[PDB]
Amino acid sequence: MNLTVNGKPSTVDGAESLNVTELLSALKVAQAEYVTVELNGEVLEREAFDATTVKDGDAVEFLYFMGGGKLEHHHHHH
C-alpha cells in the first residue's frame, strides 16, 4: 500500500491494513513508548497508535528526533 513518509512517495509491498503501531514496527522504532509521529499533519497520542488504522493512499510522518553525543560503553565481556 502507498504511503507518503516524510514527503517520500513510497509504498510498502502489499501490507494488508496496518495501524500506526504496525507502521512504528514496520519502520522499526526502539522507543515504542516515547515515539513521536504524525499522519497528514495530525500528531498521534500515546494511545492513538493502536486505534488509528492506516491504509493505501495516506501519509505517515516518522520523526528521528533525539540521539546522544556520547554513548560509548560497549557490552564486551570475556
Chain position carrying cell 501490507: 15
Cell of 60: 505517515
Assign residue 42 the CATH number of its domain: 3.10.20.30
| Total number of domains in the chain | 1
Residue with cell 514527503: 7
Query: Do β-strands 37-39 and 60-62 pair in parallel, antiparallel, or remain unpaired?
Result: antiparallel
Tell me which method was used to determine the 3D structure. Answer: NMR
22 and 39 Cβ atoms separated by less than 8 Å: no
Where would I find the beta strands (DSSP E) of the chain? 2-5, 8-11, 18-19, 37-39, 42-43, 53-54, 60-62
Parent domain of 10:
1-78
